């Protein structure tokens, strides 16, 4: 429970940093749709969760490098929050 809350804080820091760095990298490329923070934060969630909606994605080199940072840090930190909430529900099954 104490470690699960830490992984949540790590995930939020990746999302805010990944959203800010994506806008900073994509602005300047003709045709980039990842140019505002409110939806770049939504893109960082799509990346961390790998939900695959395919509506926003980076088109630049650094914007894709920022995505790789959000991929490695996001999928890992989200997998921890997923596994932590999975063990919590497992304990609720034995309690019944």
């Amino acid at each position: 429970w104490r470690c699960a809350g830490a992984a949540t804080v790590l995930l939020v820091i990746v999302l805010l940093a990944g959203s800010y760095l994506a806008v900073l990298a994509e602005r300047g490329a003709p045709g980039a749709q990842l140019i505002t923070y409110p939806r770049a934060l939504w893109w960082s969630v799509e990346t961390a969760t790998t939900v695959g909606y395919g509506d926003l994605y980076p088109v630049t080199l650094w914007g894709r490098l920022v995505a790789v940072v959000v991929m490695v840090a996001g999928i890992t930190s989200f997998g921890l929050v997923t596994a932590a909430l999975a063990t919590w529900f497992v304990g609720q099954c034995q309690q019944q």
Partner: antibody
């Protein structure tokens, strides 16, 4: 109060340079981008470039002639634009606008009436 | 490069009736359009943000609509202080582009 302050006018000789200022005031965040819009007399608004002062990175209009240099100083909260090698085609009112990173230009300046003549 | 074509360029209106400013985009941009007002010897004033969301202080006579490529700024019952140039601007793709503009004429 006036959130974005700009000088009244700037007279320059054909072929010279000038540095337009845009003094800011009020709330300032790290997600704030400063833009610049050119409006020639009798014409519509024309985007020139954007800059985020908290980082120092600036982008410019690739479809027109790149005759500006966007700089910013975080201490005085004032953004600058270096209009160099100006001609008759550069006599316009240059507005600066603040963007909260969400896309729109919520607050504008007063515009600097730059005239290029001998 | 999004091409925001505003048509018509001059809108002649009778007082008290509803008017509509059309702003077509070169491609589908969702609802990432914004409307600005600039009067004579003035600065552009934001009217509508994100197609329909209103701005504090702007009179609610200004109403926005449209999505995809076609967008509409509507003034329910016009008045004298509405005589200005109106510009639409997109933020869906970089760079941000403006529209050709539309002037509002009143037939008094």
């Amino acid at each position: 109060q006036v959130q974005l302050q700009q000088p009244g006018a700037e007279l320059v000789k054909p072929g010279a340079s000038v540095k337009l200022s845009c003094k800011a005031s009020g709330y300032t965040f790290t997600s704030d981008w400063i833009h610049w819009v050119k409006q020639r007399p009798g014409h519509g608004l024309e985007w020139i470039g954007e800059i985020i002062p908290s980082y120092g990175r600036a982008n410019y209009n690739e479809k027109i002639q790149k005759k500006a240099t966007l700089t910013a100083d975080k201490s005085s909260s004032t953004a600058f634009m270096q209009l160099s090698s100006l001609t008759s085609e550069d006599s316009a009112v240059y507005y600066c606008a603040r963007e909260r990173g969400d896309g729109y230009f919520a607050v504008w300046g007063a515009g600097t009436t730059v005239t290029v003549s001998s | 490069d999004i091409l925001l074509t505003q048509s018509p360029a001059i809108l002649s209106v009778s007082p008290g009736e509803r008017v509509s400013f059309s702003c077509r985009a070169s491609q589908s941009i969702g609802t990432d359009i914004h409307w600005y007002q600039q009067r004579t010897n003035g600065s552009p004033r934001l009217l509508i943000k994100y197609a329909s969301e209103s701005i504090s202080g702007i009179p609610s006579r200004f109403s926005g609509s449209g999505s995809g490529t076609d967008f509409t700024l509507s003034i329910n019952s016009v008045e004298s202080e509405d005589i200005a140039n109106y510009y639409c601007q997109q933020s869906n793709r970089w760079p941000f582009t403006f529209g050709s503009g539309t002037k509002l004429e009143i037939k008094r």
